Design a protein around this nucleic acid. Structure first.
Lengths: 106, 170, 137, 197, 191, 118
RNA sequence: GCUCCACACAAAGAUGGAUACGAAUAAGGCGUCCUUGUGGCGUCGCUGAACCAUAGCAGGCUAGCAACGGUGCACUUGGCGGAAAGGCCUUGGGUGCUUGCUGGCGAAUUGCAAUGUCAGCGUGGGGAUAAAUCAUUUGUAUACGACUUAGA
RNA sequence: AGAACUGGCGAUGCGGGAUGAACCGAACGUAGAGUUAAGGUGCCGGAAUACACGCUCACAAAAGGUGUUAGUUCAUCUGAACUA
């Protein structure tokens, strides 16, 4: 096919933060097409994978990934807190985060 | 909030070897029960000499609407105090119940006349059973015959951050 | 020519006996009609037909419609029903292009994946025909 | 949702459009604003002119060279009121304020791309009618921006060329939009109508 | 108080045909057609049948109806402006100082020529518009008639003449010789 | 002194530049809108003049003056400038397809060591 | 900038499509009528949730049925775009594709997930081209600078 | 001025107050998940360009407004003086 995308796309935004103290445990995620929390409830628990490049070829491929889940809803507009294993670099606020579809429970 | 309107009846306590006092009754409009009993004490201290502990309270009721789908007209006598003592006031309110009027009155008292929920004391509310007893012009503005107006320049609220439409009122 | 050019701007008008499409509530996309008017904002709506309970409403929640009929001042449930079907507004409504649209996206919503695949292959064929036939002149 | 949105300024306000363009930058959606002349502001032309001048009298005493500057071409007024809303100290903001490109008019090749609007910053929707407002290009012309006459001359060029294209296109569509009518009512069309289209 | 509806009365006589864009209005008449942009009025026009027009502010207010009634006066000034027209007779008074006013056309000017009013060695000119009929009246010495369609314009350039004549610096009533508008009225009569 | 001229420092150019031009007119001949001289020498001239009403009228007068040497000047090429809502902008420089020596010499700071391949 | 040899990259965040009148918003499009209107008739909008595109090993190899399409690429006509034009249409052949229709062979073993893919290029040393500089001279410049001449 | 009581600071972090010895909360072992106080939810910045009815065009205290909205009391057919 032309389009093999199996994953909704999204934007990384912030770490969770107070007005001053951030808490870079849990990235906050914006999801494309979710405008509302009850839309979120579908996504909670899928596997987010942040994907980027490294010019030094590591495993035989220069494309690297961090994985992680999506835990709970955030705010009324449908931000969704995700926590990766190794926290997102904060180099990327507003970079495209991919939200796969599985675990699949419907 | 949504108001609810409580019939309230004090027995206020009978003295020694004196039975069954005069069982005062009032209609208070609150948003819940405790606010009511709060008032019924509050006013009832003033309306003649008593005291909270000295008295008692018996009956409480939520008096539902009479006929909630009949559009009804009202007029209302207010006592509210600012800066100095009150000025007893009167209005007319066109709405679908007793409660809806009372509410709208509160919002209005907050919108202009600047006296808060402690201060306002409903004296009496009444439906206007015929027409033409309606003096205030803004009310009977709608009492005319064959009444029509359009949407005053419809404002649609789009739920996205982009439209391609160059939207129109229409 | 001597007839004037003043015109037209014919819009929807609040008035008794106007079917309104309620856009949010427990109705959320049904029809009712305006019994009678309270003031610049609040009105009293109902129809027993589409199920909407008769209630006050603040016009924000509700969009007017091109369709209306005739009806007394402060009518009632049964009445508004009899006048309703008497006016056959349901037929009239659904006949329109508007309601065709609402029904359209409603159904496109319900497409099963496989159904959606049907839709792919068909539109491929149909497209191919229109392209064949067109661009021959 | 496009890689690059081309946003129109006509009929918008500043503060509202500014805020939105901002936050969208901080989430990394590239933006090219266009037709800055056409922008609007609350308030009559007087009040705005006063606030701007009262910003013209803010300078630095020892020397003006690094002190408060003043900008004219509406793109730069908008740009200002926008950049106030980004943190341009950090590398976040500076990485954002690069994603924003403001123009005046519609320079190539953005004519040929579909423009969009922001429904929450439009004037027609927001401001209550019968209440004064201001057009930006005016204000900026009266604070010394000189080029307004040229801009019109260029748009009165584009709009003509535009109108030609939009003509032919529509004309073309009349074929297809009518052509489909013969492919209608056929079986396959009956189905595609039953499958929800 | 937000009046729910408001309308005022307009009648278009058979002599004139009123054609209206969205809000922009043009009157056709025997004398001349008038064009006016109402875009700043914020209001709705309706017609009953062919003789008449009602102006409507829906969901009214004070300032807003204040604008409405004025557009009543402007459609009027268009109607009465074309057929019955407007005649303003201006009068340039002098005794010792001969006044020279000559309405001349240079480059298509038709501007107005004022001199030796209170002893000037320089020519005080006034610009003029289209739609003004100028005449130096015969049968009356020391007077001039300017007429036309638009109240706005005839009294506009009439006011613009009486204010080129300002006498300051000096005694106010010294010379009540001056430039005045003697007549304010129509062309017809008996209309 | 005046704050007209700020800031203080030198004029970076040996030849000045022309910061204005007479507007234009469409109905004229093609006209040479300006020209540049070489001032050579100061001097003084006596004369008389016609100035009615002035106290020097028809009256022999003396004042110093300045002379400027003015070679008749040679033209090579044309550049039209488009107008853009930034400023003007050039399109292309053109020339005479034969140039004099000196204008060639404008394109070399070192003339003798160069290859004259310009 | 070119040529030779020796050796180094490659022969702030993508994964269908950035999908184009303008103007008012107390109003406008679209089709249509006729004389050409500030006209008549119809109709639309109340979301882009739209529209196109989309099947085939990450997209193979092969049989035809229709139809002269659609589509690629490279040759190619012609015209337009100078607001940053570098973009768009277009004409003419070939080349491949086809999913509009029906065929036949291939896939595993990557073992139940842990993207699992499909965004000519500088080095340093030669040869050559054109320079520019220091230096030298001059003086309209000048404290040093810096600047202006001349030196084939 | 010192009169008394009674708190808080002195030995004291943390959330908010754009910033602060005196203000609003809040007791400090290290961590994980949840829930709130105080304060807020245009952007800077986490959170509703939410919904609702209304008002207005940014210590000086008594005031003036042919401002504006709603009421008060007097009399005709709308007026007067005022109150908010």
């Amino acid at each position: 096919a032309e389009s093999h995308r199996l994953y909704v796309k999204g934007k990384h935004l912030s770490y969770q933060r107070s007005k001053r103290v951030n808490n870079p445990n849990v990235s906050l995620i914006k999801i494309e097409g979710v405008a509302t929390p009850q839309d979120a409830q579908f996504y909670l628990g899928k596997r987010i994978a942040y994907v980027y490049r490294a010019s030094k070829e590591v495993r035989g491929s220069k494309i690297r990934v961090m994985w992680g889940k999506v835990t709970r809803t955030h705010g009324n507009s449908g931000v969704v807190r995700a926590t990766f294993r190794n926290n997102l670099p904060a180099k990327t606020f507003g970079a495209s985060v991919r939200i796969f579809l599985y675990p699949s429970n419907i | 909030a949504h108001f609810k309107e409580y019939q309230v009846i004090g027995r206020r306590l009978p003295t020694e070897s004196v039975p069954e006092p005069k069982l005062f009754r009032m209609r208070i409009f609150a948003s819940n029960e405790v606010i009511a009993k709060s008032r019924y004490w509050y006013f009832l201290q003033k309306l003649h000499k008593v005291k909270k502990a000295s008295g008692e309270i018996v009956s409480i009721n939520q008096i539902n609407e009479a006929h909630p789908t009949k559009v009804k007209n009202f007029g209302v006598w207010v006592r509210y105090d600012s800066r100095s003592g009150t000025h007893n006031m009167y209005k007319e309110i066109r709405d679908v119940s007793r409660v809806a009027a009372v509410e709208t009155l509160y919002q209005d008292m907050a919108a202009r006349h600047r006296a808060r929920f402690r201060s306002i004391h409903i004296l009496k509310v009444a439906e206007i059973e015929k027409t033409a007893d309606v003096k205030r012009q803004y009310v009977k503005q709608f009492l005319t015959k064959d009444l029509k107006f359009p949407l005053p320049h419809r404002v649609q609220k789009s739920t996205k951050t982009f439209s391609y439409k160059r939207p129109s009122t229409f | 020519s001597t007839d004037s050019i003043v015109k037209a701007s014919n819009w929807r008008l609040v008035e008794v006996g106007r079917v309104v499409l309620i856009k949010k509530g427990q109705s959320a996309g049904k029809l009712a009609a305006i019994v009678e008017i309270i003031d610049q904002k609040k009105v009293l709506i109902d129809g027993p037909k589409a199920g909407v309970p008769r209630q006050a409403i603040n016009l924000g929640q509700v969009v007017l419609t091109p369709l209306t009929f005739a009806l007394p001042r402060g009518a009632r449930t049964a009445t508004v029903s009899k006048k309703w079907a008497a006016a056959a507004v349901c037929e009239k409504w659904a006949a329109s292009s508007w309601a065709k649209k609402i029904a359209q996206r409603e159904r496109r919503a319900a497409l099963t994946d496989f159904e959606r695949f049907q839709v792919m292959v068909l539109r491929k064929q149909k497209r191919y025909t229109v392209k064949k036939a067109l661009a021959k002149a | 949702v496009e890689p690059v949105v081309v946003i129109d300024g006509k009929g918008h306000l500043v503060g509202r459009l500014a805020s939105v363009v901002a936050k969208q930058l901080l989430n990394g959606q590239k933006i090219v604003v266009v037709r800055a002349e056409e922008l609007n502001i609350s308030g009559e032309f007087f009040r705005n002119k006063l606030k701007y001048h009262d910003f013209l009298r803010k300078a630095t005493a020892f020397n003006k060279t690094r002190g408060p500057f003043h900008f004219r071409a509406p793109s730069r007024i908008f740009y200002k009121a926008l950049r106030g809303m980004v943190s341009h100290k950090t590398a976040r903001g500076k990485a954002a304020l690069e994603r924003l490109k403001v123009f005046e008019g519609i320079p190539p090749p953005y004519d040929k791309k579909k423009r969009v609007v922001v429904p929450q910053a439009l004037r027609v929707l927001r401001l209550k009618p019968g209440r004064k407002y201001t057009t930006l290009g005016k204000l900026s012309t009266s604070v010394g921006w000189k080029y307004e006459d040229v801009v019109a001359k260029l748009e009165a060029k584009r709009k003509v060329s535009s109108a030609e294209y939009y003509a032919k296109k529509r004309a073309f569509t009349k074929k297809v939009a009518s052509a489909n009518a013969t492919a209608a009512e056929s079986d396959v069309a009956k189905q595609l109508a039953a499958l929800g289209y | 108080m937000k009046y729910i509806q408001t309308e005022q009365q307009i009648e278009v006589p058979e002599g004139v045909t009123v054609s209206i864009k969205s809000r922009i209005v043009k009157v056709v008449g025997p004398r001349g057609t008038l064009t006016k942009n109402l875009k700043h009025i914020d209001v709705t026009f309706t017609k009953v049948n062919n003789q008449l027009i009602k102006v409507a502010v829906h969901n009214g207010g004070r300032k807003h109806v204040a604008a409405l009634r004025t557009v009543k006066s402007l459609v009027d000034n268009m109607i009465t402006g074309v057929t019955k027209g407007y005649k303003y007779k201006m009068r340039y008074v002098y005794a010792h100082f001969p006044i020279n006013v000559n309405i001349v056309e240079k480059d298509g000017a038709k501007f107005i020529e004022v001199r030796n009013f209170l002893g000037d060695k320089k020519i005080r000119n006034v610009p003029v518009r289209d739609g003004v009929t100028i005449e130096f009246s015969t049968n009356v010495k020391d007077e001039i008639v300017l007429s036309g369609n638009s109240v706005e314009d005839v009294s506009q350039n009439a006011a613009d003449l009486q204010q080129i004549c300002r006498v300051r610096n000096k005694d106010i009533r010294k010379f009540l010789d001056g430039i005045y508008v003697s007549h304010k009225g129509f062309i017809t009569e008996d209309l | 002194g005046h704050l007209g001229f700020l800031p203080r420092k030198r004029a970076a150019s040996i030849r000045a530049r022309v910061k204005a031009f007479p507007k234009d007119d469409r109905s004229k001949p093609v006209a040479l809108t300006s020209f540049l001289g070489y001032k050579a020498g100061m001097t003084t001239i006596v004369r008389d003049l016609d100035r009615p009403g002035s106290k020097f009228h028809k009256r022999e007068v003396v004042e110093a003056v300045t002379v400027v040497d003015t070679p008749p000047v040679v033209v090579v090429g044309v550049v039209g400038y488009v107008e853009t809502p930034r400023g003007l902008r050039s399109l292309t420089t053109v020339w005479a397809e034969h140039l004099s020596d000196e204008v060639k010499r404008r394109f070399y700071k070192n003339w003798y060591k160069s290859k004259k391949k310009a």
